[PDB]
Amino acid sequence: LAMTMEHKDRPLVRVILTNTGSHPVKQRSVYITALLDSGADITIISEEDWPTDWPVMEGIPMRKSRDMIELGVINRDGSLERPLLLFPAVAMVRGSILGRDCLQGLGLRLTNL
Amino acid sequence: LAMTMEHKDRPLVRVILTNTGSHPVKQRSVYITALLDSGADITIISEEDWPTDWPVMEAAGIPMRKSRDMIELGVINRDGSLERPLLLFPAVAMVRGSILGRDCLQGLGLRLTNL
């Protein structure tokens, strides 16, 4: 992944979220879009992007996913980045955010070199 | 500027702010610390970090003012070397630390990449 930072374009990517828990869910993997945000310590899925039967456990009022989620970043040309596993936060936010826990899993750096 | 994204450590840089302003102020230049934020559209200096006598004006989800004076912004690298300065009118707001938004990430020529 390589994206230039521009004031006008939000650094957005497509993402595949997969629930790896035991219990049945209506849809085990969904596609969403999310912002690459070096300003967030953790990844937060918005309530509108989160499947209603994916359970959550209990400034910003947030819950954490109870099941482990596999997150795959999909690039603008459809190529896949390495999948990561985490327990994301779920909150009532504008759009989903990929924080530094995912930016570091992806090996990213901010650079003009 | 090259900074690795790490979960535990915020990507912070030292910045010097200079009021280039047409009126007097106690301090013309101040050193602050700010976060490189690919998720913010605009640069915001915290109210805690903003010199008390540098004027602000209202502008036209947090309430923010705008600097009245043009500010010169110099980003300092970890080894003390300076990036080319930028000129802007930053937003001032009650936030958790100053943030350099994509308006200044684009002025420095940054790219987000793992290649």
Side-chain angles (χ1 to χ4, degrees):
Chain A
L1 185 173
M3 312 204 337
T4 291
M5 297 286 94
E6 305 198 83
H7 172 250
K8 81 164 173 74
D9 299 328
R10 288 191 187 188
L12 297 163
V13 285
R14 283 170 293 156
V15 189
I16 177 169
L17 303 182
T18 296
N19 190 302
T20 60
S22 183
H23 63 98
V25 290
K26 303 160 199 151
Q27 184 61 267
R28 190 173 296 281
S29 295
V30 292
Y31 290 121
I32 66 175
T33 62
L35 183 78
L36 295 174
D37 188 352
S38 79
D41 307 322
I42 55 140
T43 289
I44 301 174
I45 307 308
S46 58
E47 270 193 30
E48 308 188 310
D49 289 327
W50 190 249
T52 55
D53 59 347
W54 290 13
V56 298
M57 324 186 226
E58 31 236 279
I60 348 168
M62 53 204 42
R63 285 193 295 172
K64 204 189 208 207
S65 174
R66 182 176 296 276
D67 310 313
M68 194 168 74
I69 307 308
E70 185 169 47
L71 183 158
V73 168
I74 303 156
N75 291 303
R76 227 165 56 149
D77 68 2
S79 57
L80 261 56
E81 283 301 313
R82 64 171 281 228
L84 297 170
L85 293 159
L86 76 182
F87 296 87
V90 172
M92 215 200 289
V93 287
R94 278 153 228 155
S96 303
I97 284 131
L98 307 187
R100 295 199 314 282
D101 53 352
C102 287
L103 308 203
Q104 186 184 335
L106 292 168
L108 305 171
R109 73 185 190 272
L110 279 165
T111 175
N112 52 19
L113 316 177
Chain B
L1 184 73
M3 194 146 337
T4 293
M5 301 285 102
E6 275 172 335
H7 177 203
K8 72 184 278 68
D9 302 300
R10 290 184 297 172
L12 296 172
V13 288
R14 295 189 74 196
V15 182
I16 164 151
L17 293 182
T18 303
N19 189 123
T20 69
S22 109
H23 45 260
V25 297
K26 299 159 56 198
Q27 282 201 76
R28 208 106 277 308
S29 284
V30 299
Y31 286 87
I32 62 156
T33 288
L35 170 81
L36 298 178
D37 193 353
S38 57
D41 300 327
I42 60 158
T43 284
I44 308 182
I45 309 301
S46 63
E47 278 177 16
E48 179 178 316
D49 306 347
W50 192 255
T52 65
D53 49 359
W54 291 12
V56 305
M57 78 201 149
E58 28 336 278
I62 173 151
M64 52 188 52
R65 288 141 230 76
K66 257 207 140 14
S67 188
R68 166 171 198 70
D69 303 318
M70 186 173 55
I71 300 293
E72 181 180 332
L73 193 151
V75 170
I76 303 169
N77 288 295
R78 292 285 202 136
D79 60 342
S81 63
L82 291 301
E83 290 293 305
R84 179 181 38 211
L86 299 164
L87 312 176
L88 81 162
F89 291 86
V92 178
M94 183 70 74
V95 289
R96 192 315 181 78
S98 285
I99 296 291
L100 306 195
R102 285 200 315 285
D103 44 354
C104 282
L105 308 190
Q106 183 186 348
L108 294 172
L110 303 173
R111 68 195 181 286
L112 187 57
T113 184
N114 56 9
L115 307 167

